[PDB]
Amino acid sequence: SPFSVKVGLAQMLRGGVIMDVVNAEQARIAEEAGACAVMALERVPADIRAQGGVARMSDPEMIKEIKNAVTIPVMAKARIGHFVEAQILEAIGVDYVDESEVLTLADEDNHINKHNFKIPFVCGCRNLGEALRRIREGAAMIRTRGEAGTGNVVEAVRHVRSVNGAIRLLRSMDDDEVFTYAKKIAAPYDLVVQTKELGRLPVVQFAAGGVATPADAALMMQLGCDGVFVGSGVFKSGDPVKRAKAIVQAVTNYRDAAVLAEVSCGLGEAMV
Amino acid sequence: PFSVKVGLAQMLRGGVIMDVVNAEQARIAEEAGACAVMALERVPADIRAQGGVARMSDPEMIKEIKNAVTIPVMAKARIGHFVEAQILEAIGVDYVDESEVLTLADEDNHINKHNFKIPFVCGCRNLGEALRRIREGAAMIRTRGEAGTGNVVEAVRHVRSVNGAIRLLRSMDDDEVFTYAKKIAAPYDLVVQTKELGRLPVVQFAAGGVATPADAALMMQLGCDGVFVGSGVFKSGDPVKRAKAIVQAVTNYRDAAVLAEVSCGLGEAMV
Amino acid sequence: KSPFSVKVGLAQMLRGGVIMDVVNAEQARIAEEAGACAVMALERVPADIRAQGGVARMSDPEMIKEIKNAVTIPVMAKARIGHFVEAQILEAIGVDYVDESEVLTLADEDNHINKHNFKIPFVCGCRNLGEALRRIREGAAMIRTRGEAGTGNVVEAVRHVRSVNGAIRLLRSMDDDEVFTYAKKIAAPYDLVVQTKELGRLPVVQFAAGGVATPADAALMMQLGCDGVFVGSGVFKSGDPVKRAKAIVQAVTNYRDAAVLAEVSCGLGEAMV
Amino acid sequence: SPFSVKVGLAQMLRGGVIMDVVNAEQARIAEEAGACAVMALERVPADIRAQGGVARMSDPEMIKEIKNAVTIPVMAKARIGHFVEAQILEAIGVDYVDESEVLTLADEDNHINKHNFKIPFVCGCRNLGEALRRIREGAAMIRTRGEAGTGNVVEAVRHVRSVNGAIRLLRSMDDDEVFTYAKKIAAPYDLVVQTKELGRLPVVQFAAGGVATPADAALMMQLGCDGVFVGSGVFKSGDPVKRAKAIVQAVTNYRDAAVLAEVSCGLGEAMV
Amino acid sequence: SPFSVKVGLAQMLRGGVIMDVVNAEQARIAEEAGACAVMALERVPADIRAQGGVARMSDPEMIKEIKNAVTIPVMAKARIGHFVEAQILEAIGVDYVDESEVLTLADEDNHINKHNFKIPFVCGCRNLGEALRRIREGAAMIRTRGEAGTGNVVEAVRHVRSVNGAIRLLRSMDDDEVFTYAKKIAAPYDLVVQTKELGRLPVVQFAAGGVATPADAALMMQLGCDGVFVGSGVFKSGDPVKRAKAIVQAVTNYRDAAVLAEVSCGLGEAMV
Numbered sequence A, D, E: 001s002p003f004s005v006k007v008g009l010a011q012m013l014r015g016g017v018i019m020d021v022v023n024a025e026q027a028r029i030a031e032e033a034g035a036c037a038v039m040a041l042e043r044v045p046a047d048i049r050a051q052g053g054v055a056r057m058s059d060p061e062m063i064k065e066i067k068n069a070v071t072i073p074v075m076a077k078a079r080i081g082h083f084v085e086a087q088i089l090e091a092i093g094v095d096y097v098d099e100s101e102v103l104t105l106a107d108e109d110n111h112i113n114k115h116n117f118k119i120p121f122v123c124g125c126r127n128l129g130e131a132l133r134r135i136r137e138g139a140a141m142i143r144t145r146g147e148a149g150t151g152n153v154v155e156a157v158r159h160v161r162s163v164n165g166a167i168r169l170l171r172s173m174d175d176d177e178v179f180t181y182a183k184k185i186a187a188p189y190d191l192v193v194q195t196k197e198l199g200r201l202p203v204v205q206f207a208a209g210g211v212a213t214p215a216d217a218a219l220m221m222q223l224g225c226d227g228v229f230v231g232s233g234v235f236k237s238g239d240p241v242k243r244a245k246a247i248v249q250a251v252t253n254y255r256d257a258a259v260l261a262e263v264s265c266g267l268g269e270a271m272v
Numbered sequence B: 001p002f003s004v005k006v007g008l009a010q011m012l013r014g015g016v017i018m019d020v021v022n023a024e025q026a027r028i029a030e031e032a033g034a035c036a037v038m039a040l041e042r043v044p045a046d047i048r049a050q051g052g053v054a055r056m057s058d059p060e061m062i063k064e065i066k067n068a069v070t071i072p073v074m075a076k077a078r079i080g081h082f083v084e085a086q087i088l089e090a091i092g093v094d095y096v097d098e099s100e101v102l103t104l105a106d107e108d109n110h111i112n113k114h115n116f117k118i119p120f121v122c123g124c125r126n127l128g129e130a131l132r133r134i135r136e137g138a139a140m141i142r143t144r145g146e147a148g149t150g151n152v153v154e155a156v157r158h159v160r161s162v163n164g165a166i167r168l169l170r171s172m173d174d175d176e177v178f179t180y181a182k183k184i185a186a187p188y189d190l191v192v193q194t195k196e197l198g199r200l201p202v203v204q205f206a207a208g209g210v211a212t213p214a215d216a217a218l219m220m221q222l223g224c225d226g227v228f229v230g231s232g233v234f235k236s237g238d239p240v241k242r243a244k245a246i247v248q249a250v251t252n253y254r255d256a257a258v259l260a261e262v263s264c265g266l267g268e269a270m271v
Numbered sequence C: 001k002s003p004f005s006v007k008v009g010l011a012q013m014l015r016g017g018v019i020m021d022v023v024n025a026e027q028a029r030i031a032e033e034a035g036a037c038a039v040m041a042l043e044r045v046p047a048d049i050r051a052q053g054g055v056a057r058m059s060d061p062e063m064i065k066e067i068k069n070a071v072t073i074p075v076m077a078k079a080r081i082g083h084f085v086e087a088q089i090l091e092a093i094g095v096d097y098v099d100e101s102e103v104l105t106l107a108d109e110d111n112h113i114n115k116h117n118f119k120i121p122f123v124c125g126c127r128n129l130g131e132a133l134r135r136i137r138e139g140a141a142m143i144r145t146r147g148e149a150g151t152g153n154v155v156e157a158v159r160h161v162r163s164v165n166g167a168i169r170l171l172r173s174m175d176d177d178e179v180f181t182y183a184k185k186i187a188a189p190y191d192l193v194v195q196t197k198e199l200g201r202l203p204v205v206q207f208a209a210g211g212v213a214t215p216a217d218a219a220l221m222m223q224l225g226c227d228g229v230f231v232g233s234g235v236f237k238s239g240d241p242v243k244r245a246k247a248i249v250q251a252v253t254n255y256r257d258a259a260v261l262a263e264v265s266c267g268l269g270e271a272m273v
């Protein structure tokens, strides 16, 4: 099954950190720090927030440079609904497209039909219903997003707890009430049932938004994520190389408080 | 094990706990006679003035503060950020303050404090909040006003609310306590324990706005077991003298002659 | 060990049973012969209270002694919410359970009876889990998950059974760290919420009540996971109370046997208006 | 002081039941039942409610017939603010005037200045502030009223719990907060302080309103009242003679469940 | 009676001007100008308004200096509800504490229990009910305040007229309506009656707020005050020494238009 193949590709990222990079130098830093993949974008989310202006798919020249600089998978963001941007990214050989809300919405009413592509897609979500709608559209991996570019995990905690609490609610829910639940969260019933049977999201689920410290990243993992995205927390901090390695080690050893303490020690300024 | 942590906190009764952001402030607080220090990144008046996300202190700074003093060292963690508290426990702080002056990490849940071996401080504005924090595992309650304003008005409000509610509860008809516990959304058993003790089941300190010795003795005369001072000492003109004066005020809070003496010639209070 | 757990233990005997409202000894005797596990003595059945209005109070003790004398199964009696003196009287005349009931006229809008002060067990009503746990903390030994009394419409009982059980299933799989906030949100005592989480069920017997008019209704309550059903109006406001009472009892005894449900429903005559 | 003498007169009624009577026959029934006093009025509160129309002080003729019929004290109702009605009641020798809200309000803004009278007054209240305001006007006894003429104790339970909860609040209140409390309930501070010091109301406190059964009456006594008024529950019931004695016995033995059970047995129909 | 003694102390200030001083130089100026007392505070009210920031009891060192610099009585402000601040002021020997609204409220729900102190207190008020509540708390002198630090008498005129008009209303009020009046203004009935019997406030009443010119001060006196407070009008004006003497003479000769004209002539800039 072509979708299950795409899902399997994203499973290989479990336990990893994906780092936003806007040039090839940042891409090397992330790979050396132990990132499982990099995300090519025009500006990290904290700069998109402070500066404003329309944010689009990165120039294919920049993506090519980042692909050449690393051997780990390379993701790239496309505007929501901008399926031509995604066609271009697939054509130049990115490994994943992130149909991303940090870029400027291109279609306020529809997402990309991700089934028309060979490579897997990441989509964001704030709740289970959103996650399942993205998956029905063909998303092979889900980013449970908070607020990008603020260094504040509070919304990612909210959305991780919301998605996982809804899954747990679903696990023990009376079968006969699942139809109404699927109407209530506006999700395809088959995907709701698959989630109930698995007891987890049918695709990999990473946290994203405001992860600024190793404590934050391990928090996301102890809350039940398969990995984390860091967009601004590394490359807007005082010591990106050391913070990047620290966040990777936090995610690999997310239950080991002594390791979390050690990698957090003497880490310099987090992002503003 | 929870009563062990509740008992530990008893050793701070009668004391002043002082916020410190580095080892120099920590030694000043100990020499002034503070019963413990509270390590945080910025004093609350600076967090309020400057904005920005405020998190747990870097472990390196906490280790520095631990090595500078021999009185208990507390540290702040963001509400709900249980991994920050795991780290603070792993580096050997004596108390975690799950603190509202830091940027909220979980808007819906506090830390499950029963999963830790060290005692936790939590803030409250009323009795129901205090009892909820205690049921989560807090061993000590900070009855908080407004952090970083030098204005005790909200601390006075919340101390009178908590203690007024405890006094209400003490004379309350037993049959009305069930509805009372619903009304303040508190665990009934802890409500009953408060009624039977006649005081909060854990140590209760005032915090927020304590700027002068008179403020500090005011909190004690309103029936607190101690006071936090976050900004009043180190945002003031003479930190070393004000810290000793606030400590002496809390130790001698009913002695107007002493209160007048230690307040004399104290310099500028915090802005 | 504790006196409360002894009362809770005693109520277990009622699992699988039907408790029928009776207003005289004739009704009580019919209920016992139909196989009811207990009767509920009250002044008027809920449909009559609803239609007639007026203040509804504890039954006259003479009525209760007549009902106790007529049957050997347990006798329950209704007391107004908050009216602890009515309950003291019911206890002194030897009823087996007091139902602190919303079908009677509320006597204290702000407090329920302190049921821990009594030796005999109490039933209390609830619409949701928080209500149930607050009643249990006050000392209710058994919970009646109530819909609308006297209407013959199960729709609200279904709502409240699904609500209580939905919340229990929600609780069973809930992340432990979220239970403190959950206890606050439903305004329930935390220890009882945790106990409910651990057991996967209500810590006391849970019956459905309100609007159960047919055997299908009763068996529906049982298939939604109740331990038993109250029938107040559906039996004695119907056209054939004796046949209907046996049918509902059989429905609760054999609630998964559709052939039996079909059988006991056949020719049952008119249900309540 | 003259006021404390009046207050002492009403103390002699502790443990008693006061019954509303509209003629000498009812008054004799009440005295024989053991009532500590009777309350002369034109119509029992249940009739005033169902019938409407202006309700005033009883005709002095009817009051004289009631005084001739009994030797226990005779009370009579006067309209709120109607000090001339009270002057008349005093001139014909009633023992207490009840400035009563079950009669038609004569002055919407002022109560009778009860210090200008030699005999003691009863006033109603819903909360402690009302009681203390009535007492400052010269009320020697407070009746804590619910809904008169409905046979429903719910509002009297509310008001008894309100007054008593306020007094218990006041007993443990910080002395410095009492000034603001007296402002909040709009009550004379000296009477608030006196209530705090006594731990109870500075005058006798009876329950009234909706007491229909012996259980109701004993309920009021167990809630902390000194006695009960019964306006409608006796003479609108099926068996007033038996019910009046049962209520009296209930109030005398209000903590004895076996007695309460016994006197409640076979009591006939309560009021509608 | 200890309260009547405190009241008698404040009577000696009748016909006087109390001047705010923030150092010993201002205190001498006020005494030489003929002030009956000085008020030690950290900043005059016009500066507290313009600058903001929390305003507390003056440092006891400053109060000591002001006490040493003058022989007339020395008052000091404490924050409303800050009874420890008042304990300190009593301990260092001020003659009066002003529980003052120009300082930052410390207890939004309660004032200081002034009966626990040996020295008399001043409190502010905007209306009779406030004045009487402060007096019940133990205030021995009342400051009928307008708007401090604006130089605009309009609110002090409003509040002086309000207090005096309410007293005049009370003077001629039907006795039987006084109970309801005391509820309406939320004042202790005994104090309301005392005010009605005296025909004036039971303690000394000074005006305060916006008194900027000798005309203003004499206005307050012709409206019926026993004296005036000047906080900003002297020491924020162009010629404090001359304006201070002028305001004192205005208050001493408040009905003598020729004197008011003379002392107002050539007075330089009033406060901004």
Ligand SMILES: *C[C@H](N)C(=O)/C=C/OP(=O)(O)O
Residues within 6 Å of the ligand: A020, A039, A044, A045, A046, A077, A098, A100, A101, A102, A143, A147, A148, A149, A150, A151, A208, A209, A210, A211, A229, A230, A231, A232, A233
């Ligand atoms: C969309 C991108 N992959 C991402 O995860 C952004 C995160 O925002 P930040 O809060 O800057 O980590």
Ligand SMILES: *C[C@H](N)C(=O)/C=C/OP(=O)(O)O
Residues within 6 Å of the ligand: B019, B038, B043, B044, B045, B097, B099, B100, B101, B142, B146, B147, B148, B149, B150, B207, B208, B209, B210, B228, B229, B230, B231, B232
């Ligand atoms: C949370 C911290 N320990 C604290 O007590 C803050 C006090 O606020 P401040 O107003 O700065 O004393």
Ligand SMILES: *C[C@H](N)C(=O)/C=C/OP(=O)(O)O
Residues within 6 Å of the ligand: C021, C040, C045, C046, C047, C078, C099, C101, C102, C103, C144, C148, C149, C150, C151, C152, C209, C210, C211, C212, C230, C231, C232, C233, C234
């Ligand atoms: C309170 C009584 N036990 C009861 O269950 C009422 C049921 O209502 P109905 O709808 O009449 O069966």
Ligand SMILES: *C[C@H](N)C(=O)/C=C/OP(=O)(O)O
Residues within 6 Å of the ligand: D020, D039, D044, D045, D046, D098, D100, D102, D143, D147, D148, D149, D150, D151, D208, D209, D210, D211, D229, D230, D231, D232, D233
């Ligand atoms: C005012 C009269 N004495 C009285 O107490 C009325 C009671 O009302 P009811 O509900 O008729 O007892």
Ligand SMILES: *C[C@H](N)C(=O)/C=C/OP(=O)(O)O
Residues within 6 Å of the ligand: E020, E039, E044, E045, E046, E077, E098, E100, E101, E102, E143, E147, E148, E149, E150, E151, E208, E209, E210, E211, E229, E230, E231, E232, E233
């Ligand atoms: C509180 C002080 N005693 C005072 O009277 C303030 C007056 O204000 P101003 O308007 O500046 O005279």
